[PDB]
DNA sequence: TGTCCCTTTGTCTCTCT
DNA sequence: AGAGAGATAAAGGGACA
């Protein structure tokens, strides 16, 4: 008999139980824990279900699931019930910060290292607890924290990095490797190739930071001679998430894409310059002719779709959905391209296919409005949030559908919609902003934190901003969101 | 296997002008 | 507004006890 059977059965017995109180998990959550934390994590969740749920710790099931669903999840759960009160009461962290540190493979190691090293990192090395938490909150967090403790001086003094730069490099999975590689390659990349430390930090500050730095060292000469690529272009390919894989793929596919399809090197660099850039390039090589036949999509339109994170996913999804969306839903090919040409284009496209009928029919939006909401990063999230929140926003808060669509139609649309739902009443009733002013603040990228900054100034006024009327603060918030408010405070004093 | 650490890819959100 | 940057996450491999 297949040896995995007894454990699978154990897994399923314990799982079915967790569907009960006090966690009541769903198949999705159960699968998630089983898939990364394994049977051991599922059993640990059950055994610890009562101790995590309410007082003392009072963790939500989502938080329990977030902690359990990683390699060593059982170890992280044990450690969180032990160290959460310590970290909150002895170092002044929030439960949310503790849970963030915990929710990665080896979370136990991260938690224990934060407990051990936070004081020396803050006192002796000058970091804030926020910076320590960010460093800790990735797989290998323990290694990154220990490497920051060891290398912070040499990186700032011998190599000229700011502590902020060191923190940014550390704050990725594989942070220890990136830090060590920067220490070794910074003078090589700067002195031999004329890169600024800023460009080096930009290359290093991503997962696979080590790999991207070594690949830039190895490939920069070859790429900047034989392929007429500029150093700026190579840095961009390396620093945008594509890392080592994107660089090696550009070396392979630049001449193929240029010669065979007439793409420009600028176009190839743009396709390369994202997470999964390698995947995007190879998919363009494969799919451009299939999409561009019959005067179908133009090359330019294909390049636009490809030129985002997950470009490969967007491309393949366009190929799948272009005909059904255009025919069955009446969208233009142009509109499909629009929807597809953002990070997560696949998700947005699939969500439009699914929700365009319902938003139009059940909520009285136009297809144009659905497309407008869909055509931003996180479009899927904004579409599903419009579906959920249109009746409460309109019926209870008095907003028009047009205003809801406008809030929804930016990156972070979901966040802006939820925040308006949350804060409209205190902003309007308690502080006399008009709904129109609230909608104006929220109808930009960064809508949510702009609203929260405003609410904060009205609820605990900082004298630094007290010379501005609500109307002026509203104008400021619309102009430049939370950062503009923060910037103005700095100006005051 | 369980746990830890690293790398790649994909998705979402905010900033910066 | 559209590029750049960072946050959050899934999932696979190396390593080792």
Residue numbers in the entry: 231 to 723
From the primary publication:
Each TAL effector (TALE) repeat comprises 33–35 amino acids and recognizes one specific DNA base through a highly variable residue at a fixed position in the repeat. The crystal structures of TAL effector (TALE) proteins bound to their respective target DNAs have revealed that the residue at position 13 is the only one directly involved in DNA base recognition, whereas the 12th residue stabilizes the proper loop conformation. dHax3, an engineered TALE protein, proved to be a useful scaffold for structural characterizations.
When the natural TALE codes were discovered, no code was found highly specific for base G. In light of the structures of the DNA-binding zinc finger proteins where positive charged amino acids such as Arg, His, Lys play a critical role in the coordination of base G, we made a dHax3 variant with an Arg34, His34, Lys34 in the 7th repeat. We then attempted to co-crystallize these proteins with a modified dHax3 box element whose 7th base is changed from A to G. Four complex structures were determined at high resolutions.
